[PDB]
């Protein structure tokens, strides 16, 4: 399962643009709240990575293979911050339900 997940990570292809996994999340309301709660350095790296991926998609290029994002290396930075947004979101929802 670990090797097949690495193969699927190579087949997804966002590592060839230098992106992380959390860069590829669709910005819903909860995702934008989690992005707003990021520290300044992580937010700046995320915006630069997104801008570089957009430039590479503009020129129809990819990064060199040494510059790709290694599956093992990818960091799920937004995840911790996101869970909270969802948790808080649900708590609020439940309160209203009841």
């Amino acid at each position: 399962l670990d090797g097949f997940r690495k193969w699927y990570y190579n087949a997804a292809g966002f590592n060839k643009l230098g992106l992380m996994r959390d860069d590829t999340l669709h910005e819903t309301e909860d995702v934008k709240e989690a992005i707003r709660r990021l520290p300044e350095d992580l937010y700046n790296d995320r915006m630069f990575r997104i801008k570089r991926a957009l430039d590479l998609t503009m020129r129809h290029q990819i990064l060199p293979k040494d510059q790709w994002t290694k599956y093992e290396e990818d960091k799920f930075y937004l995840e911790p911050y996101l869970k909270e947004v969802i948790r808080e979101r649900k708590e609020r929802e439940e309160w209203a339900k009841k």
Partner: protein, 413 residues
């Protein structure tokens, strides 16, 4: 019955009174005022005071707000330069979760960075609302010019420090001043046992004595700020006794002899107020005593033009009291005014809870209202005179604001 005060072995004071009131109040008192900051973390206590509804380790913000408003209870934070007090009140059937919320707020905050980044704008708004009146600004200026390090720190955050207070400063302040040896948990309308039992779930984390605060040093100085207000709010104070010293009382009797604000909804209500008078002006005596030092002086509001001699007249009246020119009936009336003010201050429930709280942190003991009455009586005429001469001689500190073209200086005063 009466209050009960067990001192726990980690230093926490527990005080309880069960009077079977329908609404019961529970407060927690910490020696963590603005005097414990230095020049590197100014305004941290203001953000800590405004950060009482932030997601705590135990409870998320939503709950800490929706749960207090669900039972209709109230959570408030009152802060002096020495002490902070977090108070909750509500129906007896909901004070268990009220103590859960309050003790979570006191003991286990999280101080998330996005929450404090949202709170700094509220800090600016609260400072503007507080400085909408001239008295607050002139008392903050008076403390800043009167003291050097400790009591000169403002209650409200400075303008440059907004945007600069971090989560680490709040965490450091809480970890260095919210320890069990500086805390008293006081409950009116609750059983002592539960307070003891709610003092174990929390208030057990930090058992230290906290990072003690520097001794406050007097500096003197006069600051005048032209602001345009037709009225020259001027406060002239000097160093006075600490809370504990016997001299303290003498100074309280001295302000009630000189005039402590009107008692009617406005004349001949003060030796000061009496001392000629053909204009609209307010004159009272100011006294603020903290555990290491005190400030006593005069406070004047007047038309800019007359601002000078009115201040001089008020000063001259205190000099008369420094020369022994007083009557025993006046001192007896001052004692009656002071003791009636104390009894009406403790007649309300939140004032009673604050008093017990303050006494706890200050002396660890409860002083029955009765005891005080006989101690105030202890103050005698000469004692009052003595405190006066202290003011009349000690280096003065002057905070002035308004159109100060005719407001005198300290070397002229």
């Amino acid at each position: 019955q009466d209050l009960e005060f067990t001192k726990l072995p980690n230093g926490l004071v527990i005080a309880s009174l069960e009077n079977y009131a329908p609404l019961s109040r529970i407060g927690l008192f910490v020696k963590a005022g603005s005097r414990y900051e230095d020049s590197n973390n100014l305004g941290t206590s203001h953000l800590l005071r405004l950060a009482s509804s932030l997601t705590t380790k135990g409870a998320s913000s939503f709950k800490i707000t929706r749960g207090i408003e669900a039972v209709g209870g109230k959570l408030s934070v009152t802060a002096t330069r020495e002490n902070m007090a977090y108070t909750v009140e509500g129906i007896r059937s909901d004070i268990e979760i009220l103590m859960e919320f309050l003790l979570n707020v006191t003991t286990a905050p999280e101080f998330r960075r996005w929450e404090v980044a949202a709170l700094r704008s509220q800090l600016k708004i609260d400072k503007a609302v507080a400085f909408q009146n001239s008295q607050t600004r002139i008392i903050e200026n008076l403390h800043d010019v009167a003291y050097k390090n400790a009591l000169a720190n403002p209650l409200y955050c400075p303008d440059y420090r907004m945007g600069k207070i971090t989560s680490e400063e709040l965490h450091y302040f809480v970890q260095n001043h919210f320890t069990s040896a500086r805390m008293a948990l006081v409950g009116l309308g609750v059983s002592h046992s539960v307070l003891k039992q709610v003092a174990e779930q929390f208030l057990n984390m930090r058992g230290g004595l906290g990072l003690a605060g520097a001794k406050a040093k007097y500096r003197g100085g006069e600051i005048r700020e032209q602001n345009g207000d037709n009225l020259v709010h001027a406060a002239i104070v000097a160093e006075s006794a600490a809370i504990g010293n016997a001299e303290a009382n003498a100074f309280s009797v001295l302000q009630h002899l000189l005039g402590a604000g009107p008692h009617i909804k406005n004349n001949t209500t003060s030796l000061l107020s009496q001392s000629g008078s053909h204009q609209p002006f307010d004159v009272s005596a100011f006294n603020a005593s903290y555990s290491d030092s005190g400030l006593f002086g005069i406070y004047t509001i007047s038309q800019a033009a007359a601002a000078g001699e009115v201040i001089n007249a008020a000063y001259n009246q205190v000099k008369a009291v420094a020369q022994g020119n007083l009557s025993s009936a006046d001192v007896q009336a001052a004692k009656n005014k002071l003791k009636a003010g104390y009894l009406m201050s403790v007649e309300t429930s939140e004032g009673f809870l604050s008093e017990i709280g303050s006494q706890a942190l200050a002396a660890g003991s409860y002083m029955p209202p009765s005891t005080v009455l006989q101690q105030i009586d202890s103050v005698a005429d000469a004692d009052v005179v003595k405190a006066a001469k202290k003011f009349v001689s000690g280096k003065k500190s002057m905070a002035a604001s308004g159109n100060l073209g005719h407001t005198p200086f300290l070397d002229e005063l």
